[PDB]
Amino acid sequence: MIVKRPVSASLARAFFYIVLLSILSTGIALLTLASSLRDAEAINIAGSLKMQSYRLGYDLQSGSPQLNAHRQLFQQALHSPVLTNLNVWYVPEAVKTRYAHLNANWLEMNNRLSKGDLPWYQANINNYVNQIDLFVLALQHYAERKMLLVVAISLAGGIGIFTLVFFTLRRIRHQVVAPLNQLVTASQRIEHQFPPLDTNLPNELGLLAKTFNQMSSELHKLYRSLE
Amino acid sequence: MIVKRPVSASLARAFFYIVLLSILSTGIALLTLASSLRDAEAINIAGSLKMQSYRLGYDLQSGSPQLNAHRQLFQQALHSPVLTNLNVWYVPEAVKTRYAHLNANWLEMNNRLSKGDLPWYQANINNYVNQIDLFVLALQHYAERKMLLVVAISLAGGIGIFTLVFFTLRRIRHQVVAPLNQLVTASQRIEHQFPPLDTNLPNELGLLAKTFNQMSSELHKLYRSLE
């Protein structure tokens, strides 16, 4: 039973790599789906920022006692963990620069609020809101890019899987099914004309080819030496 | 070569079902990721609605000539395809009812705007914005639910795959490797003591067991009938 490449070991290896590719494909898609929820929440907070931008305008105009609390809440939203987490190597620059520039433009907005410059603030709010919109767009573009990459990756994994399958089946035909058909004939021959058999297979059929030939060899001498 | 269950056919079937499960798992995750982009865009538009709610307040207060254009844009955003597409059997009621109620509450808001009731509109805007926030929350909850279902589904597919693998390998051991070891001994026996071999296998080893026995049977009579 000691063969160099037992058939079970070779199939188990194939299944291992096939299953590994499956888990990798599905795993990457699921991780990307989780990341999608975080992107959604970034988009949610950005929309909170747009609403809060107009509300500050109303606060100043009406002299609301909540002005300063609201200015503070705005600063906090701007620094939400979900937005600061975008500042990482694998997130595109389009997203991170636009995030940086939202912080920079807020500085001028807040300063103008501090100076009770309602005319300026009212004349510039559309602009700031537009900047938030472009930040959101960059986020949506990043999201779509990730999806398309996951599709590309799944297609590749697909090729690896189909290739692994095709090759293993081809190997089973060549290293298992073929020699079995030859053993069948080379057995119904000896039952009724003493083709030899491929002993160079590194699996169980190579061992059977040997021991068969060994047997089939001495029967040629025992059936001819006596007959 | 005519056997009822050739080994290649049984492996190809196993691979078929394994690959099918892989594609189903990864496919469902990718479809869910695509749906995630649509959810994100629903969240984006909902945030547009919050900003636009305060802006209408400023329009009325300042007597902006854009009031009516903005009222119109609000109505349009509210009826975006991305939001109306939520009205479907597979989207939860939590999402669809909240969407319905945003439309209903907008009716009263727009009516109060038409009556130049700035005091009411200013005293109720926080409420409406809150309703939009709860709609967003329902969307985020739907998103998380989908992800968790896709995780559950991928785990199940995992069990199907590992089960298919384990069974096929077990079958290869029982219906291929075992009879080969018996053919090996039952061949080094006849080379040097004439155990018989399992002809009831429905694969190629069952045919080889037969023809072997057929052969090994007549050699018992030809080696004893002459000796």
- For chain B, the distance separating the N- and C-terminal CA atoms, rounded to the nearest angstrom, is 35
What type of residue sits at position B76?
Answer: Q
Question: Which residues in chain A are contacts of B183 at CB distance < 8 A?
Answer: 183, 208
DSSP B91: S
Identify which of A29, A207, A219 has the shortest CB distance to residue B33.
Answer: A29
Domain of residue B184, residue span: 11-11+170-223
Token digits of residue B120: 């009411």
**Cα dist from A93 to A96, A136, A138, A140, A177, whole Å:** 5, 14, 9, 14, 57
Q: Method used for this model?
A: X-ray
A17 at interface of B, judged by CB pairs closer than 8 A:
no
Q: Pick from B47, B116, B120, B117: which is nearest to B82 by CA?
A: B47
* Angle ∠(B154,B156,B160) on CA atoms, nearest 5: 110
- What residues contact residue A49 under an 8 Å CB cut-off, 6+ apart? A74, A77, A78, A102, A132
Give the orientation angle of helix B118-172 with respect to helix A7-62, to 10 degrees. Answer: 180
Identify which of A1, A61, A219 has the shortest CB distance to residue B219.
Answer: A219
CB B18 within 8 A of CB B162: no
Cβ-Cβ contacts under 8 Å between A and B: the total is 224
Chain B, residues 66-105, CB within 8 A of chain A, namely: none
CB A113 within 8 A of CB A75: no
What phi and psi values does residue B87 have, to the nearest 5 degrees? -85, 75
Could you identify the residue written with the tokens 């200015």?
A71
Name the residue in chain A with its Cα closest to that of B146: A33
CB-based contact B181 A1, cutoff 8 Å = yes
Distance CA B227, CA B217 (A): 15
Alpha helices in chain B (DSSP H): 7-62, 67-78, 81-84, 93-114, 118-172, 178-191, 204-224
Q: What is the DSSP string of A170-223?
A: HHHIIIIIHHHHHHHHHHHHHH-------TT-SSHHHHHHHHHHHHHHHHHHHH
Resolution in Å equals 1.9
- What residues contact residue A222 under an 8 Å CB cut-off, 6+ apart? B223
- For chain A, the distance separating the N- and C-terminal CA atoms, rounded to the nearest angstrom, is 35
Q: For B149-173, what is the HEC assignment?
A: HHHHHHHHHHHHHHHHHHHHHHHHH
Identify which of B44, B55, B150 has the shortest CB distance to residue A47.
Answer: B44
CB A102 within 8 A of CB A110: no
Could you tell me how many residues make up chain B? 227
A148 at interface of B, judged by CB pairs closer than 8 A:
no
CB-based contact B8 A173, cutoff 8 Å = yes
Distance CA A201, CA A36 (A): 51
Distance CA A26, CA A9 (A): 26
Dihedral sign of CA atoms B82, B88, B91, B96 in order: positive
Identify which of A30, A39, A226 has the shortest CB distance to residue B40.
Answer: A39
Name the residue in chain A with its Cα closest to that of B167: A12
